[PDB]
Enzyme design. Structure first.
Site, PDB file in Angstrom:
ATOM      1  N   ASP B  44      54.361  48.301  31.258  1.00 17.73           N
ATOM      2  CA  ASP B  44      54.345  47.241  32.441  1.00 17.73           C
ATOM      3  C   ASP B  44      55.569  47.717  33.284  1.00 17.73           C
ATOM      4  OD1 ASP B  44      54.028  45.244  33.910  1.00 17.73           O
ATOM      5  OD2 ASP B  44      54.566  43.631  32.595  1.00 17.73           O
ATOM      6  N   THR B  77      51.151  45.050  40.612  1.00 21.44           N
ATOM      7  CA  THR B  77      52.582  44.840  40.721  1.00 21.44           C
ATOM      8  C   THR B  77      53.264  46.230  40.786  1.00 21.44           C
ATOM      9  OG1 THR B  77      52.341  42.756  39.829  1.00 21.44           O
ATOM     10  CG2 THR B  77      54.466  43.498  40.020  1.00 21.44           C
ATOM     11  N   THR B  78      52.650  47.221  39.779  1.00 23.90           N
ATOM     12  CA  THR B  78      53.802  48.279  39.767  1.00 23.90           C
ATOM     13  C   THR B  78      53.317  49.267  41.127  1.00 23.90           C
ATOM     14  OG1 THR B  78      53.481  48.458  37.429  1.00 23.90           O
ATOM     15  CG2 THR B  78      53.934  50.481  38.300  1.00 23.90           C
ATOM     16  N   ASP B 371      38.141  22.077  48.331  1.00 26.13           N
ATOM     17  CA  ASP B 371      38.315  22.730  46.926  1.00 26.13           C
ATOM     18  C   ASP B 371      37.010  23.455  46.721  1.00 26.13           C
ATOM     19  OD1 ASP B 371      41.085  21.779  46.839  1.00 26.13           O
ATOM     20  OD2 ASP B 371      40.399  20.228  45.718  1.00 26.13           O
TER      21      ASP B 371
END
Lengths: 78, 505, 465, 444, 479
Positions: B44, B77-78, B371
């Site tokens: 990760d 994210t990486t 919503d």
């Protein structure tokens, strides 16, 4: 020769063995001059048999002579 | 100089930690502690960055930037940190060879990022095919949200209105394209759907009730009763009538701005405040329609659907971005005057008019509708993918090279270097997969450069192959999320000229 | 230099493999290790060496995790798997000098490990669990490495008959943790009782009023303790406060309820599985549905043991969990016997999960290296050269066995390639009763491919806290 | 160790002459151990030959610069700098770019053909209207006289070198033009003379003016020429016989007389600079000219000698090749487009090697803008955008600071000069890229 | 590459600031102690920079600039060093703003050419035909020298000497053709122009020498009368000279052998051939110009065509002097020259008197190249800055800021003049700029005047100096 020609030395060596085994027995070497494929036999590049045989005999005779010297005696200077 | 070095070399050293972990075939890293018996191994990227203590005050900023991608989406994210680190490698080459404030170079990234998003849209595909199966699933999910809500009285009528309010958009899913009208003394089952933008509190008295080929202009001015607070200012006058004459002289200068309204070739003007009869009387002879009580919200929602812009001042006549609507109809429903717009240029929008029995039923119906529309419209940007395998990464590279044709002198190297960072992604993927990055990327750019290129990165055979035949695709939402996050990540670091050393703990 | 940092860990990893290399085989060299506390221990077992070595190197600790999984899965080969791991690291050193990225090095090990297993299964002789004559001779040879020899004749059917009841068919992994070796002081080796139902670790009440025996009893597991239709109950041992009050013993004696207290905390998880019951923390949640089923519960003491046995659980969810009872006079008897029978259960466990067996002594490692050398020409590119280095890395196991036995290193290895050409698995270890199960040789190569992979994938390490 | 010393050692060679390139360049100063030999000159050949270098790889560029100086005599700095920029970029092509060194060599070979094709398509010559061709020789002469003190009067010197070459009409050999340097007077006082001014007199006491003279190099001759000296008695006997003897005729003077005459109509002796001169008149189809430069000091004349000899050597080659190209950073910019044009179809390993040659072509005009006081990255990038797509005319201006046309400003270059620079510099870089090791024998 | 230029500018600024204290007669004197032990004291900038033995390569260029300053203008050797360092000091802040020295160097050359036309418009136009301002210019310039009352008669002698060689369009005239021969004895009041030529030595003092001859020929002869029977060898030497009728022999001075043998003196006495020996090597080139003759190495090279003409060659009788004069060279090809004899009792008189006449001839020669004079005392330095104030606003770009710094560096010269005089630096400069609204060049009533060529050459040489200083980006060792 493959390292000086800009090619993979391991990839070319394994490629030359596959062309001389599954396809047919022939002589296909690394390409010294720019070309697009294998089988330099079409280019009619030949080397003398007595010349290539003289190289392997001197290389074997030299390798045996190196193994016959286990000690290096170097005298000083006066 | 050490401030940029800590923001570059310090960040690249931290960025290179998770750089080799990009992709399933990427490298791995061990995280060792003081006691060394508590350690662990993981691939990760977000875990390695947050676990390693960093005394670099510039590296702590990158950690907070990466948290935005996790909260907004939470995927890739990486790839955000790796792409942001490659932008610093190109920015470092632009600075050291220049030593000029990077804010000018930052402006080149914004112009280059706009061309990258446009190239991904033309080549974008979607799984939305066979919408008939998607429409049947959209009406069923909408009825599920209606549970526990007062709208559960009739599920079929309300879910059908939300169905035609999404698939008929063919564009942005933002709620600003859906107008909600709330009135009293009606039944919920009597609600209807209208594609026009509807106002209330009709404008003008002697103005006509029908307008053909209307033009829309946005401006903010007060033409009625200027000088709101006159108390406290010293007034020296011989008579009282001179005080009212001063207001007429101030409003007399507004005639030049009124003349510029007629020079725009518009038949209708919109103002937030009121307008006195004399400047309103001149609107009749000049063919100007005066719309009042436009507020702000309704102005922004109208300018986007009509393709206009909002401005509070007049910079120069015959220069502006105007919207238009073919027919304006003035009707009355629910004992209140209403307005109706129709025939907007490229107009995409809808209006849901709900009839409640009180104010409590109206507020709960609008909040519960937003919503339900948010969940249904979430699938529009979801599952939609693009051609992957390094193709789209190279498509953005050649798109920036198109922008490199027409460019300023100082912005030529700033924009061209942005295309180099886009080509660093296949370079990293080729090194982590164990291939030659110089041979593959160079042959990949030559094919994709001009035309008819479906090719992409093939890691199975170690060569360039067609990704459309192998079925390698990546989500379009991931493409825009990483580029937008990396663009904002580069802005935060470059806009900081000096970095004070953080307090060591 | 991200690769040079990894090369420093490879050299440090090969140094650990060279230390274990001298300990391979029964003739291997022992290693003296002095703990920081002052305890001096020595042995030739590679699993005990790496456990007490206290390695501070992050990459070198992977050999300990592989050795732990080697004993948990196959049960044998913890020493050989470390040597095989170091061989691939040494072969990869020359690969990095040629400009080869470790990903291709790691990816080629996956195809090399799967191919080595398929080749090994071709020469392996498939055996079935229905033959009881093959399992007795297999476990009897594993007991010849211990002081107990003539008394191991009765221990061979003990381990065979216990697994065959729980083997069934297509069981795949069979956990040996459910098989408990009971070590009690007194008796002899020839005295053994299977008691397939279950066997406890504790005695019964020695005070007045304890029935010590009950018929048609339900045994529950109660973690609670009584201090200031359930026939038999269990009380968790707590040395802090009193476990069971003396007044509570007289109360439950009038109700005809058998009481067994001072139950070890380690056996709480063991009894919750085989018995198929559930732990009861509080009496408020204590019900009858969490009890067991026992036809007869009695206390039988051969000599001095005073142990309670239970038979016929007859549970649908639970299975016939068998606990083996071992008796002996001296403490060194039941100890060495415990580790000897534990290795015998691991060899039988290998045959249950994967059928077939091969002859040990480095015999298959020679032929596999010969077949992969000829099949290396069928490949092309960088991967083709890896098959040649992978075959040479498999020859370190038979070479080390020849070195640790005093025989000439290079001479014995040449005799293996010469004899294995004409014959197949004939060199003779079958006449010497040397049988190594195929799952050990399969897991040793499989775990080595994953161990070397986890090594080369680390390109750097940093301080993380 | 050898590659690191050869790459950095060759860049240090280009860093010495980097200020001597361009008309806006700067002068380099050198000081020996005696400290009294210091001389201020911008000559690239003087800097390379005077400075000793222990780097064996750096000595290769010294001998190559000598070959370039013999063909033309100028542009030797641009050859060394261009060869240094190829080696500076080669460091990035080897280490981080994963490129075979021979591939870098083959990359420049394919890129050199694209650079020569760009100069061929951009070469335009006018055969008609020789007056327009004469103006081209004026603009080329202004670029050759640049970087030298003669740039002051170069406006007057433009017609001096242009009209001199037009009086040859024959072989390109430079032995027809003899340079005479006399102290005194301003530089603008120089004139062009076809009368073959001689720096030596004849006889002890003999008549100055001679009519119907017969030149004989050594009969009925009125003029005698000997290579060695003359003894006293025959020098007096030659006067009574009417034969005038000339002395102190070197090997260079004899070769110049063989290209003119023999007989001559009038030999007139004039006095200039306090020394007897001989101006011949009435030769037979004289192809030879004489340029007499008037300097203030000996140091001004010594620098003007090789400055004029190098300027006339380039103009002599313009007679065989009439094609001209636009210079002042424009020539290197056009060749940079042809490199990126052929980069569309290229192999994987050769791509970055050829693309690095494109950036090396823009490094030469980058230094030209550095010594001009302007911003190189700002000005070159604005010109690169115009040259990128079509409409390529204007080039870098070193005076005003804006983008102006080189044809309107009178800045042009010869086609033969540029093809020699791209060639020799490419061959000079290929030699240093091949050498990964240097072994020196033990000296005695 | 800036570290090489910044190191040379700071090193050169310390040299300019050291010489700055020597400006003016009241300035501070600098002392230099040679390694041999010799110590010199003087305010001359050309002497200090020459004997300083500066090891800095760029700082040695100030010696060449000061050499051309005295050779062309003849004054301002200290001021040209101050102006050079003023531009170097102002260039330090220019490099801090990111300005490349090319723009700095190109702007100084353009500012120096425009500064000349500004001075010419404000200068007083004078001509060489008026001898009123020519006599007063050289007379007031000698007030700094030992000569005071006798300086009144020395002014017209220097004026009439230049007006003959000045002509009109001749412009620059070589000062080496003017020879000042100093000799002990006599006085300053006794002066002789002797436009023909004047030698540096006496005549033969031995017996038989005529020492005077009328209607004789003069020529340069490098031969020497020496023995190898000896009278027969010397007879053929004197006979070949009689063939061309050369009655004046000039032998180059050499310590190898003698000049004329005593036996040859009796031979030349009957022929009435005057001999002047001990001719210095410096006068060999001088006599070959004014006399129009040629140096003759051997006896065979001696011819009649290379001999000149002399009306009367005589040795003037004077105390401790005995000066030989020649009049009426009668040469149309060779132009006449001025050689003035300097006499005095003390050796310190004829020494400084020769140097005092050098500065008097240079200022007069300044009017030959460019006519007109500008009153000194900081007037031309301030007047240029007044014109460049409004002109700097008319420029554009980087050069616009250079014009402001160029005028600021010009204020260093008038500031130093106020410091060396003891007066307040800034206070005196403000009083000059305050009256600039009324007066312009007004020092005129104090009889203090300066030629325009000194102020023009000081700006031109300093502009090219600083231009060449910034051109060196590296210092390498080449042997």
């Amino acid at each position: 020769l493959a390292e000086n020609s800009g090619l993979d030395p391991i990839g070319t060596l394994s490629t030359l063995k596959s062309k001389q085994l599954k396809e047919k027995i022939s002589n296909i070497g690394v390409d010294c001059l720019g070309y697009g494929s294998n089988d330099m036999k079409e280019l009619f590049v030949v080397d003398p048999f007595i010349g290539k045989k003289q190289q392997i005999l001197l290389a074997t005779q030299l390798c045996r002579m190196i193994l016959k010297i286990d000690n290096v005696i170097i005298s000083g200077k006066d | 100089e050490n401030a940029r070095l800590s923001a570059f070399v310090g960040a690249i050293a931290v960025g290179d930690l998770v750089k080799s972990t990009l992709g399933p075939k990427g490298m791995d890293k061990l995280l060792q502690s003081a006691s060394s018996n508590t350690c662990m191994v993981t691939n990760d990227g977000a875990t390695i960055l947050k676990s390693i203590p960093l005394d670099n005050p510039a590296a702590k900023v990158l950690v907070n930037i990466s948290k935005v991608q996790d909260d907004e989406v939470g995927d890739g994210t990486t790839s955000v940190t790796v792409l942001s680190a490659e932008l610093l490698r190109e920015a470092e080459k632009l600075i050291d060879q220049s030593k000029i404030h990077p804010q000018t170079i930052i402006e080149g990234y914004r112009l280059a990022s706009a061309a990258a998003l446009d190239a991904l849209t033309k080549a974008a595909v979607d799984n939305s095919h066979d919408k008939t199966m998607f429409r049947e699933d959209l009406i069923h999910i909408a009825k599920t949200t209606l549970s526990s809500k007062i709208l559960s009285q009739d599920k079929d009528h309300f879910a059908e209105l939300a169905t035609n309010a999404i698939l008929r958009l063919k564009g942005s899913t933002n709620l600003e394209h859906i107008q909600i009208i709330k009135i009293l003394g009606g039944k919920l089952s009597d609600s209807f759907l209208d594609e026009g933008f509807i106002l209330a509190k009709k404008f003008g008295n002697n103005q006509p009730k029908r307008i053909e080929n209307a033009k829309i202009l946005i401006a903010n001015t007060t033409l009625d009763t200027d000088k709101v607070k006159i108390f406290g200012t010293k007034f020296k006058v011989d008579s009282t009538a001179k005080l009212a004459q001063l207001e007429k002289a101030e409003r007399e200068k507004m005639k030049n701005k009124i003349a510029k309204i007629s020079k725009f070739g518009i038949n209708t003007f919109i103002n937030r405040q009121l307008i006195y009869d004399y400047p309103e009387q001149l609107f009749t002879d000049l063919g100007i329609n005066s719309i009042e009580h436009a507020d702000f919200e309704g102005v922004e929602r109208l300018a986007l659907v009509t393709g206009g812009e909002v401005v509070s001042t007049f910079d120069e006549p015959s220069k502006c971005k105007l919207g238009e609507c073919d027919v304006i109809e003035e009707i009355m429903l629910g004992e209140q005057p209403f307005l109706k717009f129709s025939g907007c240029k490229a107009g995409e929008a809808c209006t849901i008019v709900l009839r409640g029995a009180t104010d409590q039923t109206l507020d709960e119906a609008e909040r519960s509708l937003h919503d339900a529309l948010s969940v249904l419209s979430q699938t529009t940007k979801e599952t939609r993918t693009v051609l992957g395998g390094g193709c789209a990464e190279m498509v953005m590279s050649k798109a920036v090279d198109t922008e490199a044709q027409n460019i300023d002198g100082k912005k030529s190297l700033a924009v061209e270097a942005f295309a180099r960072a886009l080509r660093q992604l296949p370079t990293i993927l080729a090194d982590n997969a164990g291939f030659d990055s110089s041979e593959l990327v160079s042959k990949l750019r030559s094919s994709i450069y001009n035309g008819i290129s479906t090719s992409g990165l093939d890691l199975n055979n170690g060569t360039i192959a067609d990704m459309r035949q192998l079925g390698i695709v990546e989500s379009y939402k991931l493409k825009r999320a990483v580029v937008s996050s990396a663009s904002e990540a580069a802005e935060v670091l470059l806009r900081v000229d000096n970095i004070i050393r953080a307090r060591p703990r | 230099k991200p690769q040079e940092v990894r090369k420093a860990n490879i050299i440090a990893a090969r140094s650990v493999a060279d230390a274990i290399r001298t300990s391979l085989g029964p003739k291997g060299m022992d290693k003296m290790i002095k703990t920081s506390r002052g305890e001096i221990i020595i042995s030739n077992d590679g699993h005990t060496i790496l456990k007490q070595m206290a390695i501070l190197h992050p990459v070198a600790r992977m050999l300990v995790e592989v050795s732990a999984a080697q004993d948990s899965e196959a049960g044998d080969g913890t020493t050989s798997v470390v040597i095989l791991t170091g061989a691939l690291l040494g072969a990869a050193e020359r690969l990095l000098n040629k400009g080869i990225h470790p990903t291709i090095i790691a990816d080629s090990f996956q195809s090399a490990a799967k191919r080595s297993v398929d080749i090994l299964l071709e020469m392996c002789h498939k055996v079935s669990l229905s033959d009881r004559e093959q399992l007795v001779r297999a476990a009897s040879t594993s007991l010849s490495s211990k002081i107990v020899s003539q008394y191991s004749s009765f221990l061979a059917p003990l381990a065979v008959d216990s697994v065959l009841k729980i083997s069934d068919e297509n069981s795949k992994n069979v956990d040996l943790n459910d098989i408990r070796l009971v070590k009690k002081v007194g008796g002899t080796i020839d005295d053994t009782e299977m008691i397939d139902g279950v066997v406890l670790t504790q005695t019964a009440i020695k005070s007045a009023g304890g029935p010590t025996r009950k018929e048609k009893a339900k045994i529950g597991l109660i973690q609670f303790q009584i201090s200031p239709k359930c026939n038999v109950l269990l009380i968790q041992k707590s040395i802090l406060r009193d476990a069971v009050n003396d007044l509570a013993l007289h109360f439950l004696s009038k109700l005809n309820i058998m009481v067994v207290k001072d139950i070890e905390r380690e056996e709480i998880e063991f009894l919750s599985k085989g018995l198929g019951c559930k732990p009861i923390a509080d009496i408020e949640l204590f019900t009858e549905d969490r009890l067991g089923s026992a036809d007869l519960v009695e206390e039988i003491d051969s000599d001095g043991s005073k142990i309670v046995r239970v038979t016929g659980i007859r549970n649908n969810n639970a299975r016939p969990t068998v606990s083996v009872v071992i008796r002996g006079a001296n403490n060194m008897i039941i100890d060495e016997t415990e580790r000897s029978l534990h290795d015998a259960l691991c060899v039988i466990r290998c045959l249950v999960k994967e059928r077939g067996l091969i002859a040990g002594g480095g015999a298959p490692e020679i032929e596999i290296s010969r077949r992969l050398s000829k099949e290396a020409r069928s490949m092309e590119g960088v991967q083709a050269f890896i098959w040649q280095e992978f075959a040479s890395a498999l020859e370190v196991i038979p070479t080390t066995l020849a070195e640790n036995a005093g025989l000439n290193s290079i001479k014995v290895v040449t005799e293996l390639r010469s004899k294995h050409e004409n014959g197949e698995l004939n060199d003779n270890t079958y006449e010497e009763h040397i049988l190594q199960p195929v799952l050990v040789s399969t897991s040793a190569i499989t775990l080595a491919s994953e161990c070397v992979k986890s090594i080369l994938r680390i390109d750097d390490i940093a301080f993380s806290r």
